[PDB]
Design a protein around this ligand. Structure first.
Ligand SMILES: CO[C@@H](C(=O)N1CCC[C@H](C(N)=O)C1)c1ccccc1C
Ligand SMILES: [Zn+2]
Length: 140
């Protein structure tokens, strides 16, 4: 589990969104595994606006933050799971790192701010849903 709290927005994995998230919906995209809902309180996270390919992510199944090198956001095949059928997920970045189901929502960050959240993984890989192209998260 986990979310990004920027301005009056809460960014979560679409597959882990709550009923309150759907009832306060701003934007969702199944192909990216992302959903954004509105918040009453202002958050403290800032979004990175850069092309970094190195950063640090939080792994809840280890209670640890790990440094990683990650690929550029791309269209990658993600196998059928209990949340989606076999499909291509867009804006996804892969890295070598530990991940389990329950680690989705952990933040990946670089020197400029938050880059994205854990969305996929297995067999010593971890995948992150990029948020750096969502410029509207910085206003209104
Ligand atoms: C099968 O679970 C993995 C996964 O890639 N999923 C499940 C959750 C939905 C993911 C998606 N974005 O389509 C696909 C998973 C997730 C995160 C970290 C480690 C794993 C092993
Ligand atoms: Zn950066």
């Amino acid at each position: 589990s986990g979310a990004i709290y920027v301005g009056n927005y809460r960014v979560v994995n679409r597959h882990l969104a709550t009923h309150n998230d759907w009832a306060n919906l701003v934007w969702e995209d199944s192909s990216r595994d992302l959903l954004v809902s509105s918040t009453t309180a202002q958050g403290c996270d800032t979004i990175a606006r850069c092309d970094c390919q190195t950063g640090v992510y939080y792994c809840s199944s280890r209670r640890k933050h790990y440094p990683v090198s990650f690929s550029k956001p791309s269209l990658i095949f993600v196998e059928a799971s209990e949340y989606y059928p076999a499909r291509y997920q867009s804006h996804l970045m892969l890295a070598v790192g530990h991940s389990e189901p329950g680690d989705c929502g952990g933040i990946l960050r670089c020197q400029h701010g938050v880059v994205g959240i854990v969305s996929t993984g297995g067999n010593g890989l971890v995948g992150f849903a990029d948020v750096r192209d969502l410029l509207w998260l910085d206003e209104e």
